[PDB]
Chain A
Amino acid sequence: RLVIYEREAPEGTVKDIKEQEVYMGEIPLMTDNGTFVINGTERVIVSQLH
């Protein structure tokens, strides 16, 4: 939601709120078995310990 406030205004009256939906990335979903599929092959992300 891109808002632009007016100059001569810290939080003075808003002059535009152009609300548009933007794409970003493709999060590889999880299969029912906790095994993603990244390039055709079934891959698994091992838990880390730090």
Chain B
Amino acid sequence: RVKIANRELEANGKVGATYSRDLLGITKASLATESFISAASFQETTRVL
């Protein structure tokens, strides 16, 4: 999201956002998902819902 947003903005004249990348465990990097019907298959269903 950030890379497309600030990349198009630098494509225009304004300035983006200096981001500092992270590194997450797989049980923690699979824990965040845009889609929830995916993320309710394996996560705790109640909280996702």
Touch between chains A and B, by CB atoms below 8 Å: no
